[PDB]
Amino acid sequence: KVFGRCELAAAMKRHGLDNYRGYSLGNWVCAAKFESNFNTQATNRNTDGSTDYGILQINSRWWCNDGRTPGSRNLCNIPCSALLSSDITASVNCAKKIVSDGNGMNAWVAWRNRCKGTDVQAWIRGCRL
């Protein structure tokens, strides 16, 4: 599922991401845009062998199990494939755990480099919320 900007904003608000640990809704939509292009089926291998999954590109090294990331962890206690679903509940709840890790949304490199310090409110402008 490739989300519409406002469709995704609506979905994340309903799942309580708006100002979750201080991050206004526009941050999460900005992050999703640059991490996955709003595509729940997005995947990206990275160098250490781990793989990023889903609309928020959650990493298998710590957060989900994909059966091919030796010596990793599964802190969200889920199969990584669950993160690819058209229903973002899995990704959102797992993200909630991540943004609580102590490092905030800096966990997402795309957010740090492309959303942080920008007018993130523009990502939810014009949306019925």
Which residues are known to be catalytic?
35, 52
Nearest distance in Å: CB 61, Cl ion: 9
Residue 66 is labelled as binding a ligand: no
Nearest distance in Å: CB 98, Cl ion: 6
In the complex with Cl ion, which residue's Cβ is closer, 17 or 58?
Answer: 58
In the complex with Cl ion, which residue's Cβ is closer, 103 or 121?
Answer: 103
Nearest distance in Å: CB 126, Cl ion: 28
Which amino acid is residue 120, in one-letter code?
Answer: V
Q: Which residue is nearest to Cl ion (CB)?
A: 59
User: How do beta strands 51-53 and 43-45 pair?
Assistant: antiparallel
Binding mask of the shown chain, residues 34 to 73, with x at each position contacting Cl ion by CB under 5 A: ------------------------xx--------------
Burial class (CB in 10 A: 0-12, 13-18, 19+), 29: buried
Give the number of residues in contact with Cl ion, rule: CB under 5 A: 2
Contact of 92 with 17, CB cutoff 8 Å? yes
- Quick check: helix, strand or coil at residue 34? helix
CA 45 → CA 7, 33, 60, 98, distances in Å? Answer: 27, 18, 10, 19
In the complex with Cl ion, which residue's Cβ is closer, 3 or 111?
Answer: 111
User: How do beta strands 51-53 and 58-59 pair?
Assistant: antiparallel
Which residues are near Cl ion by CB under 5 A? 58-59
Q: Which residues are annotated as a binding site for substrate?
A: 101
